[PDB]
Design a protein around this ligand. Structure first.
Ligand code: ZN
Lengths: 361, 191, 289, 94, 51, 98, 286, 70
């Protein structure tokens, strides 16, 4: 969390003094967290461009660490790889077929986000067809991002065809979002994946069907979709799909933050804490940066919620909407800040509540 | 030593009860299987032999097993009270053969044809054709009253493995006083 | 340093749970055990498909109880039928004791782990798991040499506190100190739920049977009498309408009594029983001549 | 041969079929019901023997053809009432 | 209806927790230890909750 | 082989016997309804138990001994009244035949 | 004779597993297995089962193989694990019986004389009761007709012992209907009954058509039993019953009316209490 | 869920059930019943149960495992 908390506090600022300053502690995290830290360096140097290629090699030249750096390199050249893609393509191919491949695909997918490039897509597929679990979770997202908004009939048929043909739930988790972004913004164009997926028994694909409602109907608060999506959040049984139901509202109602603090105001007290969680993330994504103080007051009582993960999302949802707002702008910003301090400095709260606390900071 | 599963098909039809062979046909089969079953295990200790009765039905009295005691013991109370059906006997013996616990043993089948076989010549050859494709060697030995060296039977062995085939013999036993000595001389030590 | 991410799940098939519960209740006074057949599909998932009981023996639930001849032969015979799965773990009941591993159990678990670093061990209390709740926690020994590093060595994940919280009746018998629990998730799929739905499914005949009118009239008469007395209180409870802080009156007289709870609650029962009975009566009059 | 609904049998009709006088149709049914070939009841004020059967007889192609034609009608009504319930209670049916 | 279910669902969870023993406290022993006498069994030097 | 068979068949019953469990002997003391009783173990708590489906509802009247299952605590069969010379009453003193 | 064959939930959940084990690779028809279970007065209890290597051929419909040693050895293990189970019959998921059933049943008669075969239609999920239990009887057919093997039918019912019941109840835990029923589910219980009665009557019609068109043999027995059902109809048009039906329909409406009124006065009282509540808070706000 | 919830609560009063005496009362939804086993237990009170039939000698029934007044 602290490794991810500071990444925000210095995103696109190149001021990694904190990681440079506190160095032994940085090494107190090993295995995967080492992959986040190596990535955290990338976000800190967000938008660094040409210096980055050497920049990444200088600090972090370990399967995880190298995998992290390659993922880190992508963040710097996010949405704008240009030349970095060719190096990333070459580097992903030559890899241990482990974490480095996981970071590699995520980095390449992020770098050529929306490029729809065939060369990148073919390599991403091969890693996905490798079926290495951890590899899949990143190849799937990398597959989706590269095909972002492309409606590629081959990609959607291929991406899903893997879903109901693969074990390794993890690979589905990437593919769930991975095929979600392939339909970004068409807003009517497919409407079949939205209906075909929502009927599949595999709960992971269902969530991907619900997310595909979010990415395919972003902004235009189509009252038809919002009725399609709230339905699953009240009736469906597999709780994970329920969360991706309530949470997915925000993406489609984000253009009109006024309606949304009312729709979920009652969802957010539902008997299964998962649906409650979706309310907070829904409130957060819904209200991107507005200090609505109406979404906030809904999250105010939630932050005391008995469940640990319902609380976790509450602070993150509050922190997400309360970014760059002084006590004068919203009269709860200073109130929550000491709540974030109190939750983090507390010792008997579950780590999960803290993760929201650290991330919230 | 040749790894092979011998699925011996012993007749138990009613005609199997008239002893043109001195004591009786059945003892001839019962004596004969004693040597074929013992012959195979002695040749290779990893072998296994099972027996299928062929009269009135295709019972599988003893599945494919290495231990020769079960085959011998099950022979008793074989009660020759049926009508032979050789059209199906080989199939059930082969189909049971396909369930070989070990997949390496070569295939070798011994049929105890001791009654007149009422099978269309076309049907028998087609059964032989299916055997050729799946590489199973089956030996046919005739007992008791029967159209000597039945044309339907003889065509079966020839198409069984021709064109310089392994030579799955159609060993015809001399009707009248003769033990398995003919059945043991030619087929048992070389099939 | 590999780590069992808390997201790692021990998938229990709909078959295994019934068979594991059945074995446990089979020898409930004593302790039963058997090997579980499954696949280590990957690091983050240990899938168990079938379980086969290892015969109860005087040793109890220990390494010795695992009869190598029984297991080698049974596996050999299940391979022919079309289940070439690998021994993925072992389970043993705990007649009411809970979902924890004792010292002797730990030694077993260490043995199983010797053959594969992911052999999950489960429990299955047939006495506590007596209702909708199924007390079956999965467990994998946390090798004692990892005290320098983090126990439950998980990494990026967030499903650690979900589906459970550390049960107290076990945390005392050694958890996150020598044995950690692995999230248990059941792989029920269609074509299996449908066949289980038949357990209590009624039939076509049911729903057209008209009840019997002799006990129906008695029942209708009985409930109407009981609701009548409940109206008397409703009159007294309302006609009182005492206003000495009525909001406090409505909270100092709450005992699941007259006003509504024993009121229309009966109306729903009385009206549901009649409407269904009547509709059945008229449907039969049409269908049957 | 009765039309089913008119399962009653006027004394005259039974006496005419068997050419047996009315005084003994009373006893004829008395027997036939005694062995177990019927499970009806006898009336005398009207002398119509109410009939209820538990003793079936062997059938015939035409009898079965006739028996099936009636049953096609019965399933037609059972189908019709099913639709008139499912359609009516669609909202509640859940 | 939600508020009613929450009451019922919560009572199901709380109602599975094993009931507690009742024993007479012979005497305090420090600040985090209190000798007690559980009814059927004998003495016990138990701790005390934080509340 | 005949001698082996009769002993082997008895042994097979013993293998089933090892499987069979004990029933906590107890006495019934009230009948709250048609499916509930208040049974007391001979030296044991008073468990509220039901009766097995293949049991006579009636025969189990107050004082009727039963041997309930050790885990279900559901009665599985009646038993005769315990007989012991624990009687303190001469009643058993047979006069003797005179 | 066996009055019932109560199939426990575990067996139909192993058969489903058994069908999946093979059909997934070796696409084939019915999967045959052995059915273990404890006896009762007359109701055979099926408590477990296992698979037996079974291969068949569409040619001659008698080139099959049901392994003997596997059946013998398997049960040798299971009687060790649990001793209350004896081999009691076999199961095959092929919805329609085969010509091979009689011969194979004779085999399983070698292990249990009163062998009952239970057909589990694993593939279908429909009206219900996915088990059909059959026996073997060889009778002279009293009424002067050839003798033959034939499979007589035995009533089948699906039940659960305590242990499996707890597992099953949790195993669904997402589609189980409320036991109370409520008006919504009770009515659906009747649209469901009507659909069945039509469905059963339509199977009857097709068969009657088949015998009517000759394509099937006039049973001469069970054929007139359907004639028995055809006489057991109510004849509601009878006046004395028509009066007696209105009385009970009228006897109930006066209770639904009293039920309706109570729910109305309570409704009004709740609005008056609420109208006071918001109004009083309305004034109290000032 | 409410009907399931009530059914699930109704499941708590399933049989078997140990019998104990209602020694005292501590507060709403809790009790100090003392089991027939020989030990007195601080248990919880099922809401559906009537706090008016808990007379301070009452022979109430306690859940066998969870040991809660049911
Ligand atoms: Zn143990």
């Amino acid at each position: 969390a602290t490794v991810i908390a500071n990444s925000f506090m210095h995103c696109g600022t190149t001021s990694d003094q904190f990681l440079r300053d506190n160095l032994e502690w940085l090494a107190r995290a090993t295995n995967w967290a080492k992959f986040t830290a190596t990535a955290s360096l990338g976000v800190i140097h967000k938008g660094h461009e040409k210096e980055a290629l050497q920049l990444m090699a200088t600090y972090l030249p370990s399967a995880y660490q190298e995998g992290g750096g390659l993922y880190a390199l992508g963040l710097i050249h996010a949405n704008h790889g240009g030349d970095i893609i060719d190096y990333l393509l070459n580097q992903l191919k030559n890899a241990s077929n482990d974490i480095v491949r996981h970071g590699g695909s995520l980095g390449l997918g992020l770098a050529a986000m929306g490029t729809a490039r065939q060369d990148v897509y073919d390599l991403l597929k091969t890693n996905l067809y490798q079926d290495d679990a951890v590899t899949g979770e990143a190849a799937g997202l990398a597959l989706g991002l590269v095909m972002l908004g492309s409606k590629n009939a081959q990609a959607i048929e291929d991406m899903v065809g893997y879903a109901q043909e693969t074990q390794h739930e993890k690979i589905l988790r990437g593919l769930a979002v991975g095929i979600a972004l392939v339909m970004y913004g068409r807003m009517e164009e497919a409407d079949a994946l939205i209906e075909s997926l929502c009927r599949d028994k595999d709960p992971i694909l269902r969530r991907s069907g619900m997310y595909t409602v979010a990415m395919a109907y972003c902004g235009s608060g189509n009252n038809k979709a919002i009725r399609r999506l709230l339905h699953v959040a009240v009736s469906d049984v597999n709780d994970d799909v329920r969360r991706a139901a309530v949470e997915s509202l925000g993406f489609i109602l984000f253009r009109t933050p006024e309606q949304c603090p009312s729709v979920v105001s009652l969802l957010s007290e539902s008997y299964n804490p998962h649906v409650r969680y979706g309310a907070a993330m829904a409130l957060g994504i819904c209200c991107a940066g507005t200090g609505n103080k109406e979404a906030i007051n809904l999250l105010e009582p939630m932050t005391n919620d008995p469940v640990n993960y319902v609380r976790q999302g509450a602070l993150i949802a509050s922190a997400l909407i309360m970014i760059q707002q002084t006590e004068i702008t919203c009269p709860k910003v200073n109130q929550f800040r000491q709540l974030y301090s109190k939750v983090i400095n507390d010792k008997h709260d579950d780590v999960m509540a803290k993760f929201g606390a650290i991330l919230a900071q | 030593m040749v790894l092979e599963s011998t699925m011996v098909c012993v007749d138990n039809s009613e005609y199997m009860r008239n002893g043109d062979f001195l004591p009786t046909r059945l003892q001839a089969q019962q004596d004969a299987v004693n040597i074929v079953c013992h012959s195979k295990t002695r040749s290779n200790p990893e072998n296994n032999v099972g027996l299928i009765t062929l009269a009135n039905d295709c019972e599988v009295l003893t599945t494919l097993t290495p231990d020769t005691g079960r085959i011998l013991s099950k022979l008793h109370t074989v009660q020759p009270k049926g009508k032979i059906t050789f059209c199906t006997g080989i199939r059930v013996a082969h189909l049971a053969l396909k369930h070989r616990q070990g997949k390496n043993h070569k295939m070798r089948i011994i049929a105890f044809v001791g009654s007149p076989v009422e099978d269309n010549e076309k049907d028998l050859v087609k059964l032989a054709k299916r055997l050729k494709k799946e590489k199973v060697n089956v030996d046919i030995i005739n007992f008791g009253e029967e159209e000597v060296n039945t044309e339907k039977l003889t065509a079966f062995v020839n198409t069984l493995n021709g064109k310089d085939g392994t030579g799955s013999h159609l060993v015809t036993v001399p009707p009248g006083p003769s033990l398995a000595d003919a059945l043991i001389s030619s087929p048992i030590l070389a099939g | 340093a590999p780590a069992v991410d808390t997201a790692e799940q021990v998938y229990i098939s709909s078959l295994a749970l019934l068979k594991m519960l059945k074995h446990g209740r089979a020898g409930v006074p004593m302790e039963v055990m058997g090997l579980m057949l499954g696949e280590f599909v990957d690091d983050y998932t240990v899938r168990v498909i079938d379980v086969f009981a290892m015969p109860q023996s005087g040793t109890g639930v220990s390494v010795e109880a695992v009869d190598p001849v029984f297991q080698a032969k049974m596996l050999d015979m299940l391979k022919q039928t079309g289940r070439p799965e690998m021994v993925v773990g072992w389970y043993h009941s705990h007649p009411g004791f809970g979902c924890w591993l004792s010292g002797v159990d730990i030694n077993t678990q260490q043995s199983f782990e010797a053959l594969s670093e992911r052999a999950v061990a489960v429990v299955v209390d047939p006495i506590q798991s007596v209702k909708g709740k199924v007390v079956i926690d999965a467990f994998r020994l946390i090798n004692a040499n990892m005290m320098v590093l983090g126990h439950e060595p998980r990494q990026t994940t967030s499903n650690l506190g979900h589906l459970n919280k550390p049960s107290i009746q076990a945390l005392i018998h050694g958890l996150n100190r020598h044995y950690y629990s692995i999230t248990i998730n059941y792989r029920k799929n269609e074509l299996e739920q449908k066949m289980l739905l038949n357990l209590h499914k009624k039939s076509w005949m049911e729903g057209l049977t008209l009840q019997d009118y002799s006990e129906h009239c008695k029942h209708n008469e009985s409930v109407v009498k009981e609701m009548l007395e409940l109206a008397k209180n409703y009159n007294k409870a309302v006609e009182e309408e005492d206003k000495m802080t009525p909001e406090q009156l409505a909270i100092k007289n709450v005992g699941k009594q007259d006003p509504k709870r024993h009121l229309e609650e009966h109306v729903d029962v009385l009206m549901t029983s009649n409407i269904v009975q009547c509709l059945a009566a008229m449907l039969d009059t049409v269908v049957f001549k | 041969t009765r039309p089913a609904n008119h399962r009653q049998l006027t004394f005259e009709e039974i006496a005419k079929s068997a050419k047996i006088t009315v005084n003994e149709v009373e006893l004829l049914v008395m027997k036939a019901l005694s062995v177990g070939l019927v499970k009806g009841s006898i009336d005398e004020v009207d002398k119509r023997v109410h009939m209820t059967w538990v003793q079936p007889r062997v059938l015939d192609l035409q009898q079965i053809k006739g028996m099936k034609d009636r049953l096609e009608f019965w399933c037609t009504d059972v189908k019709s009432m099913e639709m008139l319930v499912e359609h009516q209670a669609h909202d509640i049916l859940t | 209806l939600n508020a009613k279910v929450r009451l019922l669902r919560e009572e199901l969870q709380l109602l599975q927790e094993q009931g507690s023993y009742v024993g007479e406290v012979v005497r305090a022993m420090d600040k985090k230890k209190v000798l007690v006498k559980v009814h059927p069994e004998g003495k016990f030097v138990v701790d005390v909750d934080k509340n | 082989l005949k001698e082996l068979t009769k002993q082997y068949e008895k042994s097979e019953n013993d293998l089933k016997a090892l499987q069979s469990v004990g029933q906590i002997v107890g006495e019934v003391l009230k009948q709250l309804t048609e499916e509930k009783f208040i049974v007391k173990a001979t030296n044991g708590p008073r468990y509220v138990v039901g009766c097995r489906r293949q049991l006579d509802k009636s025969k189990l009247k107050p004082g009727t001994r039963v041997a309930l299952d050790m885990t279900t605590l559901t009665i599985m069969r009646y038993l005769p009244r315990e007989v012991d010379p624990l009687v303190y009453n001469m009643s058993h003193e047979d006069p003797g035949n005179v | 004779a066996v009055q019932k064959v109560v199939v426990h939930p575990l067996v139909l959940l192993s058969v489903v597993d058994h069908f999946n084990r093979i059909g997934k690779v070796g696409n084939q028809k019915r999967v045959v297995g052995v059915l273990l279970g404890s006896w009762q007065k007359k109701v055979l209890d099926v408590s477990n089962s296992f698979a037996v290597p079974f291969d068949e051929d569409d040619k001659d419909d008698s080139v099959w193989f049901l392994d003997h040693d596997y059946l013998e050895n398997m049960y040798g293990m299971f009687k060790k694990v649990n001793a209350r189970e004896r081999i009691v019959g076999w199961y095959h998921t092929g919805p329609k019986l085969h010509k091979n059933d009689i011969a194979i049943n004779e085999l399983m008669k070698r292990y249990c004389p009163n062998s009952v075969l239970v057909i589990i239609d694993v593939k279908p999920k429909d009206l219900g009761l996915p088990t059909e239990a059959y026996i073997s009887v060889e009778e002279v057919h009293d009424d002067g007709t050839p003798t033959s093997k034939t499979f007589e039918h035995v009533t089948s019912e699906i039940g659960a012992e305590e242990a499996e019941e707890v597992g099953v109840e949790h195993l669904l835990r997402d589609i189980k209907d409320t036991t109370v029923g409520t008006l919504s589910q009770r009515i659906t219980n009747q649209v469901h009954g009507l659909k069945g009665l039509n469905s059963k009557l339509l199977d009857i019609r097709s068969y009657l058509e088949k015998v009517a068109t000759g394509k099937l043999p006039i049973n001469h027995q069970i054929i007139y039993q359907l004639q028995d059902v055809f006489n057991l109809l109510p004849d509601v048009s009878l006046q004395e019953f028509v009066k007696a039906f209105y009385l009970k329909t009228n006897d109930q409406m006066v209770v639904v009316y009293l039920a309706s009124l109570i729910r109305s006065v309570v409704a009004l009282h709740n609005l008056i209490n609420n109208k006071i509540a918001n109004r009083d808070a309305e004034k109290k706000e000032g | 869920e409410f009907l399931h919830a009530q059914e699930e609560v109704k499941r708590i009063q399933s049989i078997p059930l140990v019998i104990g005496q209602f020694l005292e009362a501590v507060d709403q939804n809790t009790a100090i019943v003392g089991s027939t086993t020989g030990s007195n237990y601080y248990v919880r009170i099922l809401s559906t149960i009537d706090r008016e039939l808990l007379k301070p000698n009452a022979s109430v029934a306690l859940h066998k495992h969870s040991n809660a007044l049911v």
